[PDB]
From a paper:
Previous work showed that the TxGH116 D593A greatly reduces enzyme activity, suggesting that D593 is the catalytic acid/base. The D593A and D593N unliganded enzymes and D593N complexes crystallized in the space group P21212, isomorphous, with wild-type TxGH116 crystals, whereas the crystals of TxGH116 D593A in complex with cellobiose and laminaribiose crystallized in the P212121 space group and had 2 molecules in one asymmetric unit. The overall structures of unliganded TxGH116 D593A and D593N, and in particular the position of amino acid residues in the active sites, were similar. However, the loops of residues 523–534 and 583–597, the last containing the mutated acid/base residue, as well as the side chains of D452 and Q727 in the active site differed from those of wild-type TxGH116.
GH116 enzymes are retaining GHs, as shown for Saccharolobus solfataricus SSO1353 β-glucosidase/β-xylosidase, human GBA2, and TxGH116.6,8,12 In the retaining mechanism, catalysis involves two carboxylic acid/carboxylate side chains with one serving as an acid/base and the other as a nucleophile. Here, we report the structures of Thermoanaerobacterium xylanolyticum β-glucosidase (TxGH116) D593N acid/base mutant in complexes with cellobiose and laminaribiose and its catalytic mechanism.
Numbering used by the authors: 31 to 428, 431 to 801
Amino acid sequence: DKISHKIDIPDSAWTIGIGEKFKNAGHPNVKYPMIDDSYVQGAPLGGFGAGTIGRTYNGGFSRWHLEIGKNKYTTVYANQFSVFQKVEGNKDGVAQVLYAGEPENGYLSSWKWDYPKESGMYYALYPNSWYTYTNKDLPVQLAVKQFSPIIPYNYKETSYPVAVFKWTAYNPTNKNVDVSIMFTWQNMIGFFGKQVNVNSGNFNKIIKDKSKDSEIVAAVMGNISNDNEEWNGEYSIGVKKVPGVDISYKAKFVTTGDGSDLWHEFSKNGILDNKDDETPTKQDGIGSAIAVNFKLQPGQTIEVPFALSWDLPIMKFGGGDKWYKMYTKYFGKNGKNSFAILKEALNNYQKWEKMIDDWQKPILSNKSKPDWYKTALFNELYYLADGGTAWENGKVGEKRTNNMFGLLECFDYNYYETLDVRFYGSFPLVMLWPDIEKQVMRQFADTINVQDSSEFKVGSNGAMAVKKVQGMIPHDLGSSYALPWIKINAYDWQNPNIWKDLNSKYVLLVYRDYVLTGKTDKEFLKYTWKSVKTALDKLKEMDKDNDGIPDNEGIPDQTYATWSMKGTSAYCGSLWLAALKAAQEIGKVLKDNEAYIKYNEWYKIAQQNFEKELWNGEYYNFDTESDHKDSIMADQLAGQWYADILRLGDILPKDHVQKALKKIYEFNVMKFENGKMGAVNGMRPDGIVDESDIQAQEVWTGVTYALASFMKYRGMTEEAYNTAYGVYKMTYDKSGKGYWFRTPEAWTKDGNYRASMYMRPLSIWSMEV
Ligand SMILES: [Ca+2]
């Protein structure tokens, strides 16, 4: 491994061997069907709202999120990088597809598959990933740096459906070597969204953009139809000329064939035929190839950039709505712009590398923080692009100034912006893309007073319930199977209109977004103020016994739905107290004295009653009326956690909060599998896990990271990082369960999981306040 010195991979990059087998992998722990795409994953490519492409550590383009809201795991075997190498003096060279595997069926059988084990490494520190290729049969060593321009405070490049592959080649031997690098890509128009004739009309063309000191050669893979539909658009691959390399290409090879039409050319001398052919296909799958070839002398290094783009302008949801994706603002809407996107990338990628370095450097240069924490912090951000992200630039048909945004809870529970989950999981957005965050909260503000009196069947018990009640904040902003943004509360497993936690969380999210963007945006507080007042007022009506706190009813009425709360709970109670104190402060800022005095009076009566009902000398009781009332809940003081972030001071005494957190560490962390798997939700005071519900026996990964940040702000540094380490270990480490780039909601003590690719563990960014 001499190639690693010639590139700059950071020490905190997650690492694994190409073709490595992982034996300890976790699986779903529920009865009902659930996504398990295996441990063969990698860092995604593509911007926010663009659709994403997961290229795995084995090299394959396998996890397809190009249909917005859907997860489709299947390797498109034609999509590869391949290498030819020939030492001078030798009669024949050697060709190899850089993929640790082979096709299932007989297509592309002529290609050299099965990249051998122990001959290269994969590295990832999102948005960057790397592959090194160190093979005894290949005297020249190769490496590639791949990424998309995911850049905080940038809402432009961050939206781009593009990826750059920056190759580096070095000759450590004492002989000249001829080398070629080839990018192949299938014309994937019709991969999704086309009901019949899936390849019909697909055709490939070659663009040669000649100019002074900048030759670009690219394949544009599109369709002869100009229909403005979900399925129609273009893919493009290409490369930029550099000193010392020649470019060659093949416009059309058959992907539904043995591939020797391409491979007989490449395997001979690493040079393609330069055959243009715009003939449309009927049933055969087609693809394009772009190759560079060059001669490396002993000790010579050379660098060459390839790129990939996809112009698929329209996203369609199952309810019928068609929207334009965000990137169309900068490239157009007609779906004929893939070359323009590719060109932009090939000419500006170095500026993008530096911009990515600029935002990662403040954390990476901090030597007080361990590498493992940095690994988790950056790589958890994968989900912002991979979470079925929807970011609209006009409805098809239809002008407006705001661009609506949605991030899925996950793919098993296909709900956009689930409010509970984004309470924990929206920290990266508020901290790194605050204009998206504020847009999402305005979307919620506009739904507060929506009344939908039509009745739906509740999934858990079969009872009938009203869809959306006036003054109650929605559970979610729709599903990709139906109508995101337009039809809210797609969730039907419980009735969220009776929930005691969502209205409080909403108000806390509003004040968080004011506080964490500099306490400057009065216009935002102005816009949300009436919804905030309405949210707290409706929740006050649920106070039955008149202690100033809404009563949990012993039935599903908060996010830990099946782990039943009754009376005053520590969870909803603390959130209620924090929400009231946040609303006081908004009242002061907007000079709404009536509201200030009201929410101040409610706060004082509730604070007093919360402490009297729940404080037990060591921690705060789960609730006042359940059979598991004295359980130690990991999330018991969630309101105080947010109160620290929002700079609202003490809602509860400092001494009591410190004892409560120490107890959670002593029990929920350290007595659950030696503190190596995070904080289990519920533990009994005797030291055994609360078995009253499945949710109590689960570690929730986002809750554990949030708890770690709470510990961190309260000076409990060892406890914070030790608590968070178990989540890192399980996700990323060789002794974990193989959840890298699909961090789940939860696992049980055996390490098996519920709901991979989950939003909540983005809460790790709460540790960077
Ligand atoms: Ca009450």
